[PDB]
């Protein structure tokens, strides 16, 4: 009964949003839900609704279920593939603040030209993990879903093709989705700098 339920929700978490979990996690996650719904019969359809908001909730260092390829972070240069369900534990964007202080150094007939300069675009550098290995990710090309806004703990789709360079993953606008979420005890931590 249960893991027949858990089974079937494992594989609607892989197959509708490439969610990968531990077995154990997710009993406990199913016993948990039937215990906070008072009822030991919801519907496939709502159990797996609800695990997947358990989920997005979940701080992934909980799960110790490794996501993303043995080896990345040692290779120095290189390409990923796959789908890759991560976790983004902060993001800041990098390039105003190095703008700036390139700006302060800048400073610091007759015709002169006088050569636009447009303001370097937003380069969100997201601090990820799924839950074992740490790794950044960098807004390699514009990402508009993505923003210095998002809480910590939010679950993010990293896939495709995917360059990286010293332990940065070059994300470009289709290599991701924001799948939403939030780790209370997270955003704690980052609302206090």
Not at 63 to 83: A, C, T, Y
Not at 108 to 125: C, D, F, G, N, Y
Not at 126 to 133: H, K, P
Not at 148 to 175: A, C, H, W
Request: charged share 20%; with cysteine.
């Amino acid at each position: 009964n249960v893991t027949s339920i858990a089974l079937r929700a494992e594989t609607w978490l892989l197959a509708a949003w490439h969610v990968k979990v531990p077995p154990m996690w997710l009993e406990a996650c199913i016993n948990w839900i039937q215990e906070e719904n008072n009822n030991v019969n919801l519907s496939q359809a709502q159990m797996n609704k609800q695990v997947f908001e358990q989920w997005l909730l979940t701080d992934l260092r909980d799960l110790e279920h490794p996501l993303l390829p043995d080896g990345i972070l040692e290779i120095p240069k290189g390409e990923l593939n796959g789908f890759y369900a991560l976790q983004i534990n902060s993001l800041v964007d990098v390039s105003q603040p190095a703008y700036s202080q390139i700006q302060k150094l800048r400073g610091k007939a007759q015709v002169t030209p006088k050569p636009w300069e447009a303001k370097p675009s937003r380069m969100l550098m997201l601090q990820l993990t799924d839950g074992i290995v740490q790794i950044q990710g960098m807004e390699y090309q514009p990402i508009p879903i993505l923003h210095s806004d998002l809480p910590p703990g939010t679950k993010i789709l990293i896939y495709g093709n995917i360059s990286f360079r010293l332990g940065v993953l070059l994300l470009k606008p289709e290599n991701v989705k924001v799948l939403g979420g939030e780790v209370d005890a997270l955003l704690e931590e980052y609302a206090q700098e």
